[PDB]
Amino acid sequence: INNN
Amino acid sequence: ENLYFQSMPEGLEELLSAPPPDLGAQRRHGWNPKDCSENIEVKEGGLYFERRPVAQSTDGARGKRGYSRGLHAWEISWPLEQRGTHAVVGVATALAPLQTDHYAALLGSNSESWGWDIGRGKLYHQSKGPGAPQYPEVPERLLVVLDMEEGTLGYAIGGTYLGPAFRGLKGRTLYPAVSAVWGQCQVRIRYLGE
């Protein structure tokens, strides 16, 4: 999540 | 509206109407490449930073200049799609930690930092989240207003000051700061004076  | 306006720091209208500080001034008061998370890269000599994609980390940065007196305001520009789960804007002393091993509202999670969660609208100071009070949707740009003569931190959106968010800041040296969790987020800082 969170583009990680 | 009358309540918020009557709370404005002295000199704010003239600071905001003045010809804005040039790029050199914006870079001198911008993000510090020598004072940020190891997962953050400061770009354009301080105008913005980019957080690298790193899983299960919250990462912050401080501005190069710490303020102990006078009025200081800066615009933060943070794309709506790059905020993720915890996007916090505010200030920190030089002692606040700028990295943690999980997604959190790192800025404001201790006694060395003060933050506004721009996603949830909550204020953090010595807070892990439960009980954090609400403070006045945050668009891409917001103004951060640090009044070190009265010792307050407040914000403005769309040209309207929303009142003091935190008080009792006199006697400290405070730096612009944010904590971020989003891979590849680009957070800009535009110092406006004094």
Chain A residue numbers with beta carbons less than 8 Å from the beta carbon of B82 are: 3
User: What residues does B179 pair with on adjacent strands?
Assistant: B60, B88
Whether A2 sits inside 8 A of B184 (CB atoms) is no
Question: Any idea what DSSP says for residue B172?
Answer: -
Residue B145: HSE in the Cβ half-sphere, 13 Å Cα cutoff: 25
**Residue boundaries of the structural domains of chain B:** 1-194
Q: Nearest CA to CA, how far is B10 from chain A (Å)?
A: 39
Does residue B181 belong to the interface with chain A, where contact is any CB pair within 8 Å?
A: yes
Whether B85 sits inside 8 A of A3 (CB atoms) is no
Cα–Cα distance list, B28 to B5, B14, B24, B25 (Å)? 30, 22, 6, 5
**Cβ–Cβ < 8 Å for B105, B86:** yes
Q: CB B79: neighbour CB atoms within 10 A?
A: 12
Whether B182 sits inside 8 A of A3 (CB atoms) is yes
- Residues sharing a CB contact under 8 Å with residue B179, sequence separation 6 or more, in sequence order: B58, B59, B60, B86, B88, B98, B104, B105, B106, B107, B115
- The resolution, in angstroms to one decimal, equals 1.6
- Residues sharing a CB contact under 8 Å with residue B6, sequence separation 6 or more, in sequence order: none
